[PDB]
Design a protein around this ligand. Structure first.
Ligand code: GTP
Ligand code: GTP
Ligand code: DTP
Ligand code: DTP
Ligand code: DTP
Ligand code: DTP
Ligand code: MG
Ligand code: MG
Ligand code: MG
Ligand code: MG
Lengths: 466, 458, 461, 455
């Protein structure tokens, strides 16, 4: 067997090695056809119909482009076809762990439904990957193409989730750079972002300001602190700052859209009210809940955006409350956006504090009185992907005149117009009562609360609260 | 009220009148979010994740663009906002009737599951539309914006499905041109095509060779045989031929892709095996089947691509056979392509004949025995949307020097490189049994059947 | 009625016959022979676009915005007269550009006529006047209901700002209740105007770079409201993040393309060649009077003939007088370019002023390194990065409205939007190049540069 | 030496080998920056500002993509880096011979100004290429990267123009025959030049874009065909190849043969004719040439670009007044006037205006017209091989037998394809623009159509 070719609108005609095809053609992978990339975003941006599946193809492709580019430019690195395939597999599979409506699931639902657990989609991707390989007889196929499953499966997992002194077992320090491609734990510059920037922009109605292809052409491996790392050409540092600007633009405009988020929130609410009643059969016929399906991959395999429609179309009276919420989404009786503010302090509102926030807004004393249950307060952390840190400080560069010498480039060396801060918090407030009287009041509470807390004046404060 | 603005990747920022928004924000319309434009095409073209919903928005928008362009250019036509809204509503709603996996449903499943009925998605769109309006109190909202429901609802239905002498009740002969926008029964040149060309191309990675915005700018209404018709500028005729060429390119490459079609076929097969066991709740809690959900719009409202997953994820042993078929799709163990005939010019084989064809192939005795149930026979039409007729012969044009005089332009006036024929047919045959022995036999039956019928080719 | 033109950025554009009449003149068609990005084309092969097509785009977008406002707000009393005047101003604001666009007013004129104060905007106004007067356009304007005296003043004002002192309303062409009309083509209050929108889209299309700001969205959300007794265009409050993105895009385009090191050195070499050819090239102006490249700006009939063509005239000449200028252009073709020596790190604000630029090569040559080159051997390029208003934040000069009170204008400060935004809105850096390309000359130039950086207390290699 | 990277809007970031850069950075190549791809088309489609230069980069790039794809897929073909570079050079350089306003120059101006000569831009590309190599010391550079100049220069020329004087090629043997199919495919016209211009012209014109061209590369394979190794396409792809020529024809109808774009090319031609004697272009040894004779000396030709247009427009010399007036009429949009169209051989074209003037119409006329007053434009629409179907000259392979080449006939593909692959229209224009002259021109035209038949 040789290559399948797939026409992707973002990347064009992509060639896939038969081993990759084998992996793709499984229930575990094809599942991703039923999970929207942007979850509730589709309910705001009608072009955002794309699912995780096509995004995963893009990531595997780009991973392969980068590893190949490096091997061609730098034969001395001894990159093998085995390495290439392992990297591509990791790129293809890093999204395997996503649940219904993507980041809604691990960002909102699981934290509320299982506050005791620490779960991320990455962990899910690793478990789902195991289940995919084991269930479908992929290990012998891997061997048939020269992979060594013990080492390589560990390598692939490590590329997705990080380690399970050099903390990695799958490859040695002299292949360290291979771990920088798919999910770059040092600085977040990886092929996953490059695909989603291009793909989301295409579907969204926007065009990305950073070119992934250019970055691949200027990438080189250099020694950095006794590690072989991928470095970028010095010239490119402005582009990297642009990259994270784009990322942040995309968060502002789409991923954290005020209405997209409230729809994600309403879905989450509905999943919570349904969690006790929906049964998902896992291994050996054992029954799981939406919140526990993450403990068994056979059950998880069946957990997709379909759960939304299962609730919407149900007749069971136990689900009436969950069903009503989803019905309100369809009529567009959503909760109403009241305003946004930020903390002025460097200390951030912590996850445990979130719950108390509606009570606080209702407490504020500026026709109708409003209760805490009437308000929704959404805390959004916006940053450059590494909390307070500047990821560019964690990038190595090289100059044209000395390609092998890795260097750091500080923010002040690039521009004084860059951010002084790399992380912030936005508080959005919504009201569940939608009549004009309730809204006007909600506005008053909000502005008063912002003044009480010493938060930033909402942009429309003069108008909504004179 | 003021307009909602929606960012569409194909058309950019689109303004929607509140009455349209009211119609959109209903279970009946939002349903379209869960029906893929290209059905099983997504399983071949990974970018084709788009659903009927966004396409419907595009169609409504373009309908509005055209009606507005005409009203602005030609005040004498007396086009009202009422007309504009009715046209937009019809554009928004002409895809309402589509079922799971779009053309799979009315093209494959319903013909096999209810051969007695004559159902098209257009008829479904009309029934859905009625249900949408009645269920959601839209009529008073229509009146609030100056529409007259009895006439206008009839007008909207007529725009989608044709007439229910001047055969139309919704508008008189002096507004005839309004019927040419959304679903053009004279020649197929309408806004539905323009949206899907652009949108499908964007998602597929293919190119649209026809510029719809241009066509709108050069469109004019002129008197043609005592009717006021939309006419195109004379020099646009080459573009109209290109438009149908593009349509046909899109059919060859994507809509009738061999593997996209076989996946639609396998899905159909699974729906058939599940039809007796899946329940869809309709009005009053009554339970419907997949094949009968078309009789109750409350049940039809919930019939979407979701059924696929409901079968895939079931544990009921009665559904094991349907579930297995879908599982085979996931492993890529598909029904196998046996062969196709070379194209013949006739468009000989008619829709009613399709059902008998597998029996026929099985009947062939060539030089492992197979039954009719083992074969699938797919009749593929390539034409210019009006069977043997050239649709451009049914288009009126005007010249720059005499904008009010409508004229005809014949094929020979345009180019000798154009088609001599406007319709053709191919037959593809597939086998449900996938084991080498079964395949070899299927090939024999196929070749023999081709010889018996006087068709040709591998 | 209308001509239709297919533009790749905007699609099929309709033009009113008066506009067509203006376009179909030597003065306007001239713009076909002036590259948008000058020497950028020698770095970005897609950047073949000329000012002409950009101008059509600007006129179109001007018309889109004025129409959108008039449709949404009949109470503003926007007339077809106003629409046409705005479109004319949009079409014509690039008329004054010289060969290789910003090279000409940014580099060549300052070196060739240091005594003169000349900008392309001022050129646009003069060229506009010459276009109308030379081609009998005034009667055509009157035929479509324009009143030339008021409207020509209005059009000029829209391009260059007030022609006429403390102060309140400084414009004559339209009153305060039409103030918003001045915000469309060349927005002197904050730089948010249709010129940027077209060039963002067009430059990105040709460059292969990407625009992060959507102009058409901004038009749909734009509304006029009363602000300090003026009727001003206001943006929807939630669009403020997009406006910040717009200035980010602008700056991305400067960094990547408009101030590309090699694009700039190629502009410099062209400038040098024009300087060496200035005495020999003759351009016939009014009455047969002969002008030079540097004096063609004094007569619009001569200026009309001054385009990128001059480059090729010099390149393909055989006249021995032009040998020096020709050699420079030939070095461009062989890619034997003036050599990049180094640049400083950015320093906040725009400390070095335009007037100071000329002294800088003398200064670098004056530096005495511990380990010989003249001022004429060096080129020193001052590069400004800002938000288009020196040290000011342009968004502080934007009015907004909220959904719940569309008629009430408000201000939104930076800290209301994001803490990730710039603390500073302007910065500068200095690049140095050497005209002598041999290794010995280069090594020396590096020494002078490093020494000069140490002397001045600057930073970086 | 490493690669230069160039950002091209059509193809993205392109890598160029230093030898290619050395060829590009010459007066002979850079000249192409000053020649518009679509000539007078820019005066109708304002986005069509693109020049031959950027198109040439694209062609060199796509040539390299194809040759590399084949070498990677089929190691047994023994494709060397030498071959790759020679192919890329040929792709870069096949447009070198184009004159002012591209096809206007060899299609209109040279036939009218030097009817005795037989000149095409391809021949020009070969001569210019020789001049570029010899003038700039490129031969030693070629050797420095492993080329053998005598063979490889011949090979490059052959790729552009065909055989110079059984296997008729000297540059490569029969077992590398497929290499000759990449840059300028004389068998069927399917080559990288078309792929670039489709994408690029569409991007600039404002027609929409596709990637089918990269698709064709992925499915291309070399197979034995009649004892030659030829590039074959996957059977599946035959519909796409038909689409390719449909697109080509769409582009001709809409843009390349636009009625007004052509009349502008015609007016530019007319102006060049009236200026030909007065413009001097210095060639080798200081010898002076004309616009029409610059094609005899590559040093002079090097300097012949769209610039000539402006040189005429901006002149004050009274000898150039007639040429300058025509160009001025272009700017005021007072164009030669379209008289009509009617639905044969190249040699006949020049006699056609004389013939239309000879026609004696019945009608009483305000003015008599001469041959010099008429322009007659013969417009060929075809599939690039006159009457032949180029797909009949394409070899295909099937998935199950990749090494066996086969033919696929038109009737195997679709009955909706053209019955004819070539057609002609005649357009007539009048240089005199007053109403009296126009009315008369109409009469002559209609009468001429009746006289010739084909009314
Ligand atoms: N007039 C004019 N048209 C241009 C220009 N650039 C591109 N075009 C396009 O060229 C097309 C053809 O030129 P027209 O001036 O319309 O020529 P025509 O159609 O022969 O003459 P009309 O009968 O006046 O329309 C126009 O419709 C425009 O879309 C320009 O600078 N001036
Ligand atoms: N050499 C060359 N580069 C071009 C041309 N057109 C566009 N370019 C691009 O412009 C950039 C110009 O820089 P170079 O010629 O490399 O100039 P430089 O970087 O100072 O010189 P190097 O040190 O050789 O890189 C290149 O990297 C190309 O991407 C051309 O005609 N010749
Ligand atoms: N003509 C086309 N243009 C663009 N994309 C196409 C075209 N035909 C098919 N595609 C898309 C659908 C798929 O994503 C990809 C490959 O499809 P296709 O080439 O038809 O392969 P296939 O696997 O169906 O055929 P085979 O196995 O016979 O090679 O290209
Ligand atoms: N910055 C942006 N750029 C591009 N598209 C956007 C941007 N912001 C939102 N969109 C998209 C999402 C929707 O399809 C459409 C309208 O969104 P938006 O203006 O955010 O409306 P909204 O209904 O949330 O706000 P409001 O009701 O306050 O006007 O535009
Ligand atoms: N089929 C087409 N598709 C896309 N663009 C086109 C097409 N035909 C022409 N154009 C472009 C070129 C111009 O910029 C614009 C208008 O051209 P076009 O309509 O052909 O000529 P014209 O408008 O001068 O004819 P007329 O004056 O007779 O109306 O559209
Ligand atoms: N940030 C960018 N984004 C997109 N294109 C760019 C960018 N910077 C430059 N380009 C374009 C212009 C050129 O066509 C091509 C290469 O330019 P660039 O990388 O700046 O090389 P250079 O030759 O100027 O630098 P060096 O020789 O130092 O590598 O890419
Ligand atoms: Mg296949
Ligand atoms: Mg809203
Ligand atoms: Mg015209
Ligand atoms: Mg360089």
């Amino acid at each position: 067997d040789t290559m399948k070719v797939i026409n992707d609108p973002i990347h064009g005609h992509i060639e896939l090695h038969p081993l990759l095809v084998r992996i793709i053609d499984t229930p575990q992978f094809q599942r991703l056809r039923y999970i929207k990339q942007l979850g509730g975003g589709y309910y705001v941006f009608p072009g955002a119909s794309h699912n995780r599946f096509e995004h995963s193809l893009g990531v595997g492709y780009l991973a392969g482009c980068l590893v190949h580019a490096l091997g061609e430019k730098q034969p001395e690195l001894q990159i093998s076809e085995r390495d290439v395939l392992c990297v591509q597999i990791a790129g293809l599979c890093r999204n395997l762990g996503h649940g219904p409506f993507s980041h809604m699931f691990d960002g909102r639902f699981i934290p509320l439904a299982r506050p005791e657990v620490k779960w991320t989609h990455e962990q899910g991707s690793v478990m789902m990957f195991e289940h995919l390989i084991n269930s479908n007889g992929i290990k012998p196929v891997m061997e048939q193409y020269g992979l060594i499953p013990e080492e390589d499966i560990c390598f692939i997992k490590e590329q997705i989730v990080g380690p399970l002194l050099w903390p990695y077992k799958g490859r040695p320090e002299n292949k360290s750079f291979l771990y920088e491609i798919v999910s770059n734990k040092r600085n977040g510059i990886d092929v996953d972002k490059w695909d989603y920037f291009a793909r989301d922009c295409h579907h969204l109605g926007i065009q990305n300001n950073f070119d992934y292809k250019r970055f691949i052409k200027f990438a080189r491996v250099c020694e950095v602190d006794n590690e072989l790392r991928i470095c970028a050409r010095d010239k490119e540092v402005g582009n990297l700052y642009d990259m994270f600007h784009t990322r942040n633009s995309l968060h502002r405009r789409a991923y954290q859209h005020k209405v997209g988020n409230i729809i994600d929130t309403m879905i989450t609410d509905a999943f919570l009210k349904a969690d006790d009643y929906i049964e998902i059969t896992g291994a050996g016929g054992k029954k799981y809940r939406i919140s526990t399906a993450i403990d068994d991959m056979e059950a998880y395999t069946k957990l997709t955006d379909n759960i939304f429609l299962e609730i919407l179309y149900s007749t069971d009276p136990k689900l009436k409350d969950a069903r009503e919420i989803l019905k309100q989404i369809e009529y567009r009786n959503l909760f109403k956006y009241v305003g946004e503010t930020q903390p002025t302090g460097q200390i951030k509102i912590k996850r445990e504090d979130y719950e108390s926030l509606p009570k606080e807004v209702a407490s504020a004393k500026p026709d109708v009185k409003l209760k805490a249950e009437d308000f929704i307060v959404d805390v959004i952390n916006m940053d450059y992907g590494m909390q307070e840190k500047n990821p560019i400080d964690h990038v190595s560069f090289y100059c044209k005149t000395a390609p092998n010498r890795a260097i750091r480039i500080t923010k002040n060396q690039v521009s004084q117009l860059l951010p002084e801060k790399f992380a912030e918090q936005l508080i959005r407030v919504y009201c569940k009562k939608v009549d004009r009287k309730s809204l006007y009041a909600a506005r008053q509470y909000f502005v008063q609360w912002c003044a009480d807390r010493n938060f930033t004046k909402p942009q429309d404060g003069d108008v909504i609260a004179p």
